[PDB]
Each structure stands twice: as structure tokens, then as C-alpha cells.
């Protein structure tokens, strides 16, 4: 599955959003028989932790997932052309690295929990 | 011991706006859903809107669905109704009430358990 | 709206029935038909909820029932203080919620 | 009438036992079932 | 992520249902290099087995999930106030422990399988 | 959970599609402490790789999942009675084994990616 892996790394965020399955397929798989086994276990744990997050936001089973959390201009003020047409994901990740623990909290600690309780309350009616 | 008091009534010209506010005490506000029900001067009771206990789910009658907003502040124990684009057909006494729905973890409350005394809204 | 007759009347100490007729999507589909007693000039008081239940503090002379698509309020032992406009309401789904009938002005 | 106590060497699962006496290990059972009025569409 | 973990354990079931992500985040991550590795593998397997169930019922990617399986009064007869407002999850788990292999069967062996075949039959129309 | 496992292997594909949870539950769980641990890790990795695919197609959390990829008569020309009523899954798997890397590509490389972008574009409106 090492075909096209990270090929879009230098591409803009828009162009690089059409190759998400290429990278996704490359995330998941005697002292020599222990250290490499630990690496395999670590890879599994890392995969599942990201899957656990995606699930905590209602983004389970999705590579592109939208929510009800507004974008705060204090995180980034760039336009949509300066993000998806004139910037790469590496540059964006560097720009937004100070806010990823805030956004994730809003994804988990505000939305989805409210959405799940609201769905629970709409289903009783 | 439960008391609901509506304020913010009055006479508004057609096409104007009015915000009603219902204060409540004697029970835990955040534990019950709230509704607004109106009665035209010569008619019976009509349900207008329903908001859940957390203030996240709002329901309206079609005749007001795009004009009225129902909101809650559970720290101030205050329910409010923002009435936009008032019509002559909206002249009525507007009562706030406790009940109309409940959480899936609570017993059904498809009734209005407590009522206030009512704000008079006149459009003319 | 629900169908309920106006101007129903009784006699002190007797039994009177107020009958609220709806349709198959509301009274005939859910067991959530409430009755309210509104004295003129005052807000309505809840008298019956669900079908047969009474709030605490409400006398047992007010007895609700339902058959088919018709619900009724039976008041047994009418008092002078029972003169009021009575209303019925029913839960009717998620697209709409509470459908009220016309008021019945009960005299004694 | 009388009781006599003597030092004992015990075992080594006495020196550490005196420190671990306040700790318990439990397994988390995160999956639960309960009645609600919520019905699936 | 060990912030608030099991803090709601003594809280009522209702209050304790708003902290599901707190416990969920704490479930997933030379003889000394083997035994602890086995523990890590075991933790992964336990996580996935619960995820496998949640998925077998159509509750995948959800922390609160509703179904079409009625509650049987033979399992518990308590009201909704005596469960969600006056009882904890530990007390409930002890009360319902004799029925969890029946309910799960109804979740897997009755509903969802029927739901999936019904969806399969509605999609052909 | 080894009850009914592969019991439907000799049954027709239709009859054998009602036992998917039986096999699904049996897929997931000092040199002697390493080799068997590697086997456990391998089983987890194999499980997750299939789960990763199911997710890449929008079939996450589902045992029966329908898509928008048409069936090509060049892959198989048999009718629906000759597949679901008169054939087993072993015979079908042997018949279709030359096309599984084409179909999967269509499931990943054509549909779902288009579906996800279309959903992303319908949600902005
Ligand atoms: C690299 O940049 C050029 C423009 O300078 C662009 O045409 C090309 O597509 C980019 N490479 C990739 C892989 O997107
Ligand atoms: C955006 O972030 C700032 C802090 O930098 C915060 O004060 C503001 O409230 C945030 N916006 C919203 C809508 O919460
Ligand atoms: C956003 O668009 C405006 C309008 O064309 C442009 O002037 C600006 O440079 C763009 N990016 C920024 C820095 O907001
Ligand atoms: C992130 O925060 C650090 C300080 O902790 C600061 O030096 C850095 O410039 C910040 N980066 C951005 C993109 O704001
Ligand atoms: C413990 O019980 C008291 C009432 O006895 C309650 O107020 C408190 O919130 C409970 N603790 C937690 C963590 O819920
Ligand atoms: C509830 O459980 C009893 C056995 O304790 C069983 O006989 C009964 O049929 C169950 N209820 C339903 C609706 O299946
Ligand atoms: C359920 O509610 C009833 C009515 O208030 C109450 O009497 C009972 O104790 C509660 N719990 C039980 C044991 O069903
Ligand atoms: C569960 O079953 C055991 C017998 O196997 C019985 O002793 C116990 O009391 C039961 N518990 C409940 C809550 O019914
Ligand atoms: C085996 O084939 C016979 C018909 O020859 C059929 O009746 C039987 O059900 C089949 N076995 C299974 C397990 O389906
Ligand atoms: C079916 O497969 C053949 C190759 O065997 C291919 O030429 C044809 O285009 C395929 N059908 C469709 C609809 O793409
Ligand atoms: C499909 O159905 C036709 C019509 O009954 C039948 O003749 C044929 O043998 C079946 N299978 C094949 C080979 O297409
Ligand atoms: C699959 O392809 C091989 C050649 O690589 C061929 O020998 C075999 O018969 C084919 N099987 C089917 C079912 O087409």
C-alpha cells in the first residue's frame, strides 16, 4: 500500500484532501522478537487512540467529518483560499499547533456530548 | 410553592417585536422543560413553543416557527420568548408553563405541570 | 384543534361529563390527554394528565377517561367553586405537539 | 488471663503488605445497559 | 487523561452519564518487556471486544445508543427516578448482573440483525 | 463464543448471511510468551485491517453494507438465485477471487471518496 504515500505532502490542503485513504492505509501494519513486537503494539495503540478521538467527536468511520463547532478567528484568521489553495497541511499544522488541544476539547467537551444528549431527547418524543 | 411570573408584555405595532420573560421559583428550573401557551382574548388555549430542560431543543407551531425564538438561562432561572414580526393574529395572553416534555432518563411529562399568570401582548 | 362542546352544565351534587373528541393521530394514538380548569381572569390549572392521573392537591371528583378517539372529564359532586372554563389537550407527535380543544364553560 | 507476643520473621509478604494494604486493583467495566425512554428510529 | 476518571462513580446514573468520555479515554493505553507488553495487548483486546459488541448492536461510534429492544420488568422493575436520580452505576451493575447475557443477546441476536436485513430490503425499493 | 462458528459454511450464501455475527465474534481473541503474543498481535492487526477497509468504504459498524458501485457482469454473470440460493460463500469466493482487488478499489477509489466530498458540499448549503 506504499503507493502515493505522502505524495500530496507538498500539495495544497485542498489537493491533499483527496488522498486521505493513501496515508490512512499506511498507518496500520529473543530481544529482536520483543522490540519489534512492541513497535507493532505501539502502532496499533496509536491508531486506536486516533480512532477513539474521531469516535468521541461524531466522526467515527469518516475521513472527512463536519461538526457544529464554529471556527474562532483567534485560532487562525486566514481566508479559505489562503488555507485550501495556497497552503499545505504541514504549514497549517505548524500554524495551528498551539490550538489543537482547545479545538479537540470543543469537539469532545462541548459538541457531540450535547448532540448525543439531544438525540437521546429527540428519540423519546 | 412553585411560582412563575411573566413580564415584558405590552402594545406593539404590527411588524414590531416584543420579548417576554418568565421568572420561576420553588423548583429546580434546570430539571423541567418549559413551554409558552397563548390564549387570544376571545379564544381557548393554543400551544406556542416548547424548550427542553437544557435549553438545546426548541419546537414551535408552524404559525410562529420562523418568527418566535424560545430561550432559557438556567443560572438566572429565566425563560424568555423573542417575538419578531408580530401579526394582528398574535394578540393574546402568553403564559409560561413548566412541563411539556422531559429527558429520556425522566418520566414522561406530556402535560403542563405549572402555569404562570400571563403577560398580555397586544398588536395594533 | 380538538372538538369539545360549549356550554355544558350540571346541577349541585350531580355528575357532569365534558367530552373532548379528537382524531386518530392524537387522542387515538397516544395516552397523553390532559385536562385544565381555567377560572375567568386566571391562568388554567392542571386537573388531569396522561389519561386518568391527577396532580397532587386536586380532588378525586375529577376523573378522566378515554375510549377510541374520544376523551372525557367526569366531575362527580359539582360544587359552586367548580364553575370554570375547562380545556382538553393532547400530544400529537413531533411535527406538531399539543392540540387544544375549545373551552367548555361549566356552570353549576 | 495472660497473652504473650514474640517477634516473628513472617515472610517478606509482610513488609510490603504493610505499605500496599491501602491499595486495591480493579478492572473497569465501561459497557452498561439501563432503561430509558429513548427508542431507536 | 487521568482527570475526573471515575469521579462520577459515586454519583447517580444520570449525573454519571455526562462523564462517559472521561472513562472512555482511560481504557486505551527480557521478561519485563514481555509481561507488560502482554498487558498492553490485553488492554487492546479488551477495548476491541467491547467495540466489537457496540458495533454488533448498531451502537458503533456512540457512547449513548438507543435500540428497539423493550425493557423487561423481570430484569428490573425500578422506576426512572429510582435508576437515574437515586442509584449509581455500581449498584445498577450489581442489580442487573444476572441479565446482562440476556440483554446482549437481544441486542445482537434479535435486533440489529433484523434491522440490517430490513434496511437491506428497504434500499432495494 | 465458539457456538455455530462456520456452521453455515456449507449453507447457501443467503442462509449463511444470517450468521455473520457468529463468525465475527470468533475473529477477535520466554520464547513461548513471545510467539503466542505475536499471534495475538497479528490477530488484532488483521481484525483492524478489515475494519479499516470497511470504514474506507462507508460500511463502518456494519456487517451488511450497500454501496453505489454497480456490479459488472465481467466479474460474474450468475443470477441472484444462482448466488444466494444455490451457491455457498466458499464457491463464490473462489469464483470472484480474481476481482476482489478491483471491486475494493471501486469501493475505496471511486465511491465513498466521492460520497464524502458530496456530503461535504451538501452540508455547506
Ligand atoms: C508544486 O508546485 C507547483 C507550482 O509551483 C505545482 O504546479 C505542483 O503541482 C506542486 N506539486 C504538487 C505535488 O502538488
Ligand atoms: C476565541 O478565542 C478567544 C481567546 O483567544 C476567546 O476569548 C473567545 O471567546 C473565543 N471565541 C469564542 C466564540 O468563544
Ligand atoms: C484574503 O482575501 C483578501 C481579499 O482578496 C486578500 O486581500 C487577503 O490577502 C487574503 N488573505 C488574508 C491575509 O486575509
Ligand atoms: C505558539 O506558542 C509559542 C509559545 O508557547 C510561541 O512562541 C509560538 O510563536 C506560537 N505559535 C503560533 C503559530 O502562534
Ligand atoms: C454525594 O452525595 C451528596 C448527597 O448526599 C451529593 O450532594 C453529592 O453530589 C454526591 N457526590 C457526587 C460526586 O455526586
Ligand atoms: C421477561 O422475562 C420473562 C422471564 O423472566 C419471560 O418469560 C418474558 O417473556 C420476558 N418478557 C418478554 C416481553 O419477552
Ligand atoms: C416509583 O414511583 C412510585 C410513585 O411515586 C413510588 O411509590 C415508588 O416507591 C417508586 N419506586 C418503586 C419502588 O417502584
Ligand atoms: C443472581 O443470581 C444468583 C443465583 O445464581 C442469586 O443468588 C442472586 O441473588 C441474583 N441476583 C439478583 C440481583 O437477582
Ligand atoms: C445441506 O444440503 C441439504 C440439501 O442437500 C440442505 O437441506 C441442508 O440444509 C444443507 N445444510 C446446511 C447446513 O445448510
Ligand atoms: C467491466 O469490466 C470490463 C473488463 O473486463 C470493462 O471493460 C468494463 O468497462 C467494466 N464495466 C464497467 C461498467 O466499467
Ligand atoms: C438464471 O435464470 C435463467 C432463467 O430461469 C436460467 O435459465 C439460468 O440457468 C439461470 N442461471 C444462469 C446460468 O444464468
Ligand atoms: C483467475 O485467473 C487465473 C489466471 O491468473 C486463471 O487461471 C483462473 O482460472 C481465473 N479464475 C477465474 C474464476 O476466472
Automatic annotation (TrEMBL), chains A, E, F:
Recorded topology in the membrane: Single-pass type I membrane protein
Region (Immunosuppression): 35-53
Sugar-modified residues: 72, 79, 86, 98
Coiled coil regions, renumbered to chain: 94-125
Signal peptide per UniProt: none
Compartments where located: Virion membrane; Host cell membrane; Host endosome membrane
Region Fusion peptide, annotated ranges: 1-15
Domain of life: Viruses
Transmembrane intervals: 1-18
Disulphide bonds in the chain: 59-65
Protein name: Transmembrane protein gp41
Part of the whole protein covered: 515 to 661 of 860
